[PDB]
Design a protein around this ligand. Structure first.
Ligand SMILES: Nc1ncnc2c1ncn2[C@@H]1O[C@H](COP(=O)(O)OP(=O)(O)NP(=O)(O)O)[C@@H](O)[C@H]1O
Ligand SMILES: Nc1ncnc2c1ncn2[C@@H]1O[C@H](COP(=O)(O)OP(=O)(O)NP(=O)(O)O)[C@@H](O)[C@H]1O
Ligand SMILES: [Cl-]
Ligand SMILES: [Cl-]
Ligand SMILES: [Cl-]
Ligand SMILES: [Cl-]
Lengths: 284, 284
């Protein structure tokens, strides 16, 4: 039997702010769809008592179980619903019925940072340093919570009402190599220990991503562009990248310190928040 | 400018067997579609002079260039078109026009081994040992050709007319982590050197895959089934798996020798072909 009794909040919340009232679908008005993912259909929704606007994601138990990702979904909901930070997309709670799982999510109205990046072509130093400050703050909170997988690529960053970053959890079901097989776990078995060990090398890797992200913010494209997989792997492992002429000395300093091959040499998150280029240009 | 003058065959071939006749679309009758992939539409086709049946894949230059995978496609065509082996899907040649690239492929009529596995639930020892022999022979030829990426997962194995294995090249454009960004390379940049180094640990990894595949053939599912990514990574790196009661002593011996954590301890391809369980049950 597949248990949908998650270790996650399912109590009704009074947004105007012994067994308790649980969520139900009848608690929500439904608006237009916000998007469709691999397993989720996201709708604009409104809790009826408070009229509070949020996002409701509907997933289907049958296809979750058929793809073998139901246990991963449970883990994501339990993990995400216990993170509380202004720059982390809030998961308020969940409920389920005979065929569906419902996730009650913070609504982020201004799209992803990746789309904003594509619209503006590139970000100036003030917005870049402000985004980096927000992500460094969120990443410090996350390490405090010992969260498994981190992803701060711009396509995983949503934008709040006042333009604040919201780290999302897109692509939770597709971390395994792509394939046409039914279940979304099997292809991992074909990775030998030598390769899977790289996926467990997870600590100072958020510092690397921070440097790549700062580069992509300022330049508009990531720094290790190559024509084939093997070339790209070599560019990354040997940290072979250059800056366009307009990138300033302070920006170059921070990015080059974050993109050190030796993880030991990468700065701590505290040093990023104290970096002179960050404090000079960040509005936070 | 994007060059479509590949270092790959484009001369007309006389299948009944100084500038030369080049392929053209008018050389082929087109039949029903065989499938649609991410960038390719595959059709049953027939060369008109010889009436030889093959598979024609049409790709579109605009979407290849938009996704930034045109250079990778060129590399795959150049690599694949120089491999010549009875168990490797032949790429006979290519041509192109103003908007499209055409790949002339060996037609494999009996589907993928993954589908056959799902139909039969599991394979007996004779078919298993025969498939493993064919793949070990093909992998020896490949190392002789120093081919970059190897993939022998059952969903990447097509079946010839008499049931012979044909190693395909499915999913060539999606080796990077999945994302909603336009270009299919950028997400690699966010992998630090410590993780990308695992993707370059490529030699005795075909021996690992051979063991996983032999297990999945005989059992019907891969050996490291877990409920979450992190559990799965631990199961793989610590090689924690068991056999159902029906798996024979010879099968257990070969699989356990192939699934050693230390790559040095994994047998050579020659030893696999000489293994007593293989020779006892392989019809080849
Ligand atoms: N909280 C949200 N606020 C606003 N828009 C959202 C929110 N969550 C998702 N969206 C939109 O809906 C789209 C699909 O989201 P999502 O369903 O999470 O995709 P996914 O990564 O495939 N995960 P899943 O569907 O669960 O497999 C996103 O690309 C956004 O445009
Ligand atoms: N040579 C072939 N013989 C028979 N069937 C084939 C052949 N090539 C492809 N097919 C079928 O067509 C489907 C799609 O193939 P393909 O286009 O290679 O998928 P893909 O992995 O997404 N590669 P691409 O489309 O180039 O991005 C496969 O799942 C097969 O069912
Ligand atoms: Cl490559
Ligand atoms: Cl370095
Ligand atoms: Cl996990
Ligand atoms: Cl071992």
């Amino acid at each position: 039997h597949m248990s949908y009794s998650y270790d996650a909040p399912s109590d009704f919340i009074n947004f105007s702010s012994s067994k308790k009232r649980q969520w139900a679908l009848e608690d929500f008005e439904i608006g237009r769809p916000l998007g469709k993912g691999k397993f989720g259909n996201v709708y604009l929704a409104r809790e009826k008592q408070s009229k509070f606007i949020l996002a409701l994601k509907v997933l289907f138990k049958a296809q979750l179980e058929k793809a073998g990702v139901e246990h991963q979904l449970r883990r994501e909901v339990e993990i995400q619903s216990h993170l509380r930070h202004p720059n982390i997309l809030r998961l308020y709670g969940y409920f389920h019925d005979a065929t569906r799982v419902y996730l009650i999510l913070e609504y982020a109205p201004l799209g992803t940072v990746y789309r904003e990046l594509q619209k503006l072509s590139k970000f100036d130093e003030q917005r870049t340093a402000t985004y980096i400050t927000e992500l460094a703050n969120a990443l410090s909170y996350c390490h405090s919570k010992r969260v498994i997988h981190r992803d701060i690529k711009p396509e995983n960053l949503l934008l709040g009402s006042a333009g604040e970053l919201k780290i999302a959890d897109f692509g939770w079901s597709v971390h395994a190599p792509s394939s046409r097989r039914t279940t979304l776990c099997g292809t991992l078995d074909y990775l030998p220990p030598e390769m899977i060990e790289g996926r467990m090398h997870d600590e100072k890797v958020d510092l690397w991503s921070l440097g790549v992200l700062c580069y992509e913010f300022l330049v508009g494209k990531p720094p290790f562009e190559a024509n084939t997989y093997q070339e790209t792997y070599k560019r990354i492992s040997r940290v072979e990248f250059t800056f366009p002429d307009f990138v300033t000395e302070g920006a170059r300093d921070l990015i080059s310190r974050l993109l050190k091959h030796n993880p030991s040499q990468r700065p701590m998150l505290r040093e990023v928040l104290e970096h002179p280029w960050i404090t000079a240009n960040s509005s936070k």
